Design a protein around this ligand. Structure first.
Ligand SMILES: COC(=O)[C@H](Cc1cnc[nH]1)NC(=O)CN(CC(=O)O)Cc1ccccc1
Ligand SMILES: [Zn+2]
Length: 956
């Protein structure tokens, strides 16, 4: 019946809890397509994934497909304005990104539901006729350089590329995917290449319809969506490109039995063990590598990690199958290393092979496969509903691997037990196949190679045959047992009926000296899940650096002692989060409600009766020292944010201070601290989910009762519930605090224009201003001026106060960034003056849609309430309130606000700047205004002392 469609799939299998509707099809040009109808959705989305990526770069131009991905955003023949796509999205409440992997290029956006067509049309042009404007190419090449620059001194990226540098250098695997200025401009100009041409060639050769999948999600019917996709995508030309394949492993014979000694940037100690394996993807119905991953990576009694941890050699372990590309995969087992572990690497690996050996001895286990199958079936049935943008991006990728009918279920449902495939993979995890990498500062000086892209210093050696043979003769070790039935697997999924006295917002249902309980029965999602959130206040959690360290160490020690038992819960969809804050502790327990009271109870019980294993203490204390030390290797913009938090909060201990105070933390001293911390508390909880009022009261009271029984806890006083204040900056001031980042050779800057206390009207002035300036700040500071890859603007909220911040990481110096942002703000008053009233309403509408976007899953609704609670504002209906107010605002209100609080000669401008300098320091463009001389902050304490502090916000 239809020339444009090759076929319509059968029914797409979905969870029976999934109210969205679906239709798969294949266009005549070969594009696999999933259509998703959600008449309830606030944002629509679409994604396109092309089955080409950096593994197909021309050898002489590294990073070409990554570059190309950047360039598609910057104009096409039908919408030639460089930032048409960005601006359209921004003005209709959308967003967009894209990524390039070895074999895919994935592009996605969301938009308000009623402007899908408009968004999708501009989007489709990416794949029909991009301009690759010459002048855009010159500029954007710097954005890609900067993206690489950021990655350079980071240990994950270095290791990632050293792996590729040490296999077969002829294999596409060894290519450098990001690219940079050298690879994408300098060297190609040197070599007479015209990059605009190369982009047109690569696009034309590889952006073929037969290599594409598209997902679209909207309020429209499945028929409307179909006509829509046929319309915008039928014209993508089919060039019938063979899908690249890499049947040959990049780790051939000579790349095996090798040892690599690598010097890291941070002070980390890791061991990476790797075996090449064939491509297991086509076995997705049985999934042998997940099976083995599950076992080798287990964390329960009997497990590999258990014994490594008991010998005091390792704290954490990752194991299982690692994606490679069509043709090859890897199997990994990686662990972090204690200082002892570092000297016992040979032994650690023997234990690995001993554990592998045990699996060979017992053979494949159908009951284990059965448990993965069941958990996966339950995870699927009751999956949370995804945010539309991520969902479309993800399915676009998997439309390339699975029959249309299976795309939703393919990654969840297991169908086939395959002892043959299990055994087959197992037979590859042998010493004669092994690669070993040790990452440690102890190799500084001792190395003889340099990886070319990142500068990684490392050494390579043959592992000696004595050593391989010792690994080959690994007997069984009786400390190693398979896991036993997982008792935490839930079976009760009843959705408790909705109560007569149930409310749209959480109700305060307990207001005692000890504890304040906010409660809501879920009236929206109906999954047998619940979230249980507790803020525990104690003045002794942050009274000083020493106490801070202790709170932290206590809670790390506790998590380490619970790990074995908690791991089962975690596989059963039941997990927890436990951390120290500046107010005392935070505990969250999330997942299936069916066995949640159990886990909860075990936590509070351990918490209140904890006995510290001294050896664990010593190891964790030491990881913590490195961890604080490792802050110096975080990125310049992270430093900038960090210093501003220290400058503007009433109380905050520096990393230095915590470090100094840490050699003072002794076992005696910690043992004494725990009961001190637990002795007086206040608890403010949010219990939200598939649970009743009375179940909720009981859970609350149980937590209280356990603390009382075991630690004798008594209530705090309403007065000692000190929430902290923000520094109040003088009318017309400007302060600069300056530091050096020692590792990275970029600078960072954060600029904060403080405004006033949060409240309905101050909130919406700032927020609308941010909306208006959001996309132009990106467009001006990154796209036109190319100051860096990281360019952010938006509201800052802390401690009840607020303002407007800019954050940029750059190669240029901060005084320079300063003036371009100031230049930008003028451009902004002017474009607000010049904009139509109707362009003004579009911005109101876009923010409105953003603020009113309904949470799609339980824990997003939770998060929203929790913010209301932890900020002590309790404004649960804030969104209809603020939106009502925002609609009454005019151009004039916003010009006044800007002129009062933000303009360079604003009467109430309150400006603070953190400048973080690079490793080594000390036109076409708009006019930057002359600036006042800043007060340079010398000392963070002198500075806070010398200034007022704001009130706190009044509760609702
Ligand atoms: C199937 O389970 C695993 O293989 C392990 C779990 C583990 C826990 N402690 C150690 N290992 N997880 C992984 O290996 C992580 N990724 C793969 C990898 O890079 O190794 C698998 C994964 C990630 C997200 C969600 C589900 C599986
Ligand atoms: Zn990029």
């Amino acid at each position: 019946n239809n020339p444009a469609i090759k076929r319509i799939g059968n029914h797409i299998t979905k969870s029976p809890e999934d109210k969205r509707e679906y239709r798969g099809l294949e266009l005549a040009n070969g594009i696999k397509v999933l259509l998703i109808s959600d008449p309830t959705t606030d944002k629509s989305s679409a994604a396109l994934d092309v089955h080409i990526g950096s593994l197909s770069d021309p050898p002489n131009i590294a990073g070409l497909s990554h570059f190309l991905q950047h360039m598609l955003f910057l104009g096409t023949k039908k919408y030639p304005k460089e930032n048409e796509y960005s601006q359209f999205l921004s003005e209709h409440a959308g967003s967009s990104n894209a990524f390039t992997s070895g074999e895919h290029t994935n592009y996605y956006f969301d938009v308000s539901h009623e402007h899908l067509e408009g968004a999708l049309d501009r989007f489709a042009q990416f794949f029909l006729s991009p301009l690759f404007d010459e002048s855009a190419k010159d500029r954007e090449v710097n954005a890609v350089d900067s993206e690489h620059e950021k990655n350079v001194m980071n240990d994950a990226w270095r290791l990632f590329q050293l792996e590729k540098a040490t296999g077969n250098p002829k294999h596409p695997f060894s290519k450098f995917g990001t690219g940079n200025k050298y690879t994408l401009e300098t060297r190609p100009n040197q070599e007479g290449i015209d990059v605009r041409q190369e982009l047109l060639k690569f696009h034309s050769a590889y952006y073929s319809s037969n290599l594409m999948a598209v997902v679209v999600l909207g309020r429209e019917s499945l028929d409307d969506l179909t006509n829509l996709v046929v319309k915008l995508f039928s014209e993508v030309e089919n060039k019938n490109v063979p899908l690249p394949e890499f049947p040959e492993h990049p780790f051939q014979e000579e790349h095996l039995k090798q040892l690599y000694k690598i010097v890291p940037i941070k002070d980390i100690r890791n061991l990476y063990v790797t075996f090449p394996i064939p491509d297991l993807q086509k076995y997705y119905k049985s999934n042998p590598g997940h099976y083995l991953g599950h076992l080798i990576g287990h964390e329960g009694p009997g497990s590999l990690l258990s014994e490594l941890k008991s010998k005091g050699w390792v704290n954490t372990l990752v194991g299982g199958q690692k994606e490679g590309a069509r043709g090859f995969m890897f199997f990994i087992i990686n662990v972090d290393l204690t200082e002892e572990g570092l000297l016992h690497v040979e032994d650690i690996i023997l234990h690995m092979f001993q554990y592998i050996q045990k699996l060979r001895a017992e053979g494949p286990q159908e009951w284990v496969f059965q448990e993965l199958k069941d958990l996966n079936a339950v995870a699927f049935r009751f999956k949370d509903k995804e945010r539309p943008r991520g969902y479309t991006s993800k399915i676009a990728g998997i439309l390339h691997y699975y029959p249309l009918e299976e795309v939703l279920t393919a990654e969840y449902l297991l169908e086939e037990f395959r002892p043959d495939l299990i055994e087959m993979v197992l037979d590859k995890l042998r010493p004669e196949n092994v690669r070993v990498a040790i990452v440690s500062k102890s190799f500084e000086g001792k190395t003889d190679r340099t990886e070319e892209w990142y500068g990684t210093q490392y050494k390579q050696e043959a592992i000696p045959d004595e050593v391989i043979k010792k690994w080959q003769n690994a007997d069984l070790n009786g400390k190693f047992k398979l896991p036993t039935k997982n008792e935490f697997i839930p079976t009760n999924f009843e959705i408790l009926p909705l109560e007569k006295e149930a409310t749209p917002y959480p109700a305060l249902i307990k207001d005692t000296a000890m504890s304040k309980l906010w409660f809501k029965q879920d009236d929206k999602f109906f999954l047998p899940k619940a979230n249980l959130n507790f803020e525990f206040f104690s003045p002794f959690a942050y009274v000083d650096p020493l106490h801070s360290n202790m709170a932290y160490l206590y809670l790390e020690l506790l998590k380490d002692s619970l790990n074995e038992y908690a791991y089962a819960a975690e596989l059963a969809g039941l997990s927890y989060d436990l951390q120290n804050t500046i107010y005392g502790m935070y505990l969250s327990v999330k997942g299936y409600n069916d066995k949640q009271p159990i886990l909860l109870k075990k936590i509070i019980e351990k918490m209140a009766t904890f006995e510290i294993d001294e050896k664990r203490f010593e190891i964790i204390k030491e990881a913590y020292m490195r961890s604080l030390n490792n802050f110096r290797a975080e990125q310049p913009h992270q430093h900038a944010m960090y210093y501003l938090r220290l400058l503007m909060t009433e109380v905050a201990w520096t990393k230095d201070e915590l470090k100094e105070a840490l050699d003072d933390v002794t076992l005696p001293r910690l043992k004494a601290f725990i009961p001190q911390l637990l002795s007086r508390l206040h608890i403010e909880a949010l219990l939200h989910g598939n649970i009743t009022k009375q179940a909720a009261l009981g859970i609350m009271q149980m937590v209280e009762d356990t603390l009382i029984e075991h630690a004798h806890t008594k209530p705090l006083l309403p007065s000692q519930l000190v929430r902290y204040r923000e520094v109040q900056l003088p009318d017309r001031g400007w302060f600069v605090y300056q530091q050096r980042n020692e590792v990275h050779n970029n600078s960072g800057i954060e600029i904060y224009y403080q405004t006033d206390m949060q409240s309905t009207s101050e909130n919406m002035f700032l927020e609308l201003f941010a909306q208006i300036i959001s996309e132009p700040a990106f467009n001006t500071l990154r796209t036109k001026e190319q100051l860096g890859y990281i360019v952010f603007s938006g509201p800052r909220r802390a401690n009840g106060i607020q303002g407007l911040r800019f954050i940029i990481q750059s190669e240029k110096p901060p005084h320079y960034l300063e003036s371009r942002v100031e230049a930008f703000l003028i451009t902004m008053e002017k474009s607000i003056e010049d904009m139509t009233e109707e362009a003004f309403q579009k911005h109101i509408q876009a923010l409105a849609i953003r603020r009113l976007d309904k949470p799609k899953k339980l824990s997003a609704e939770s998060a929203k309430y929790w913010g209301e609670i932890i900020s002590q504002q309790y404004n649960f209906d804030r969104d209809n309130t603020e939106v009502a107010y925002l609609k009454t605002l005019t151009k004039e209100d916003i010009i006044k606000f800007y002129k009062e609080m933000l303009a360079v000669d604003a009467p109430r401008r309150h400006k603070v700047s953190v400048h973080v300098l690079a490793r080594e320091m000390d036109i076409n463009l708009s006019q930057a205004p002359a600036l006042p001389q800043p007060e340079v902050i010398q000392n963070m304490t002198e500075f806070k002392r010398g200034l007022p502090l704001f009130p706190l916000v009044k509760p609702h």
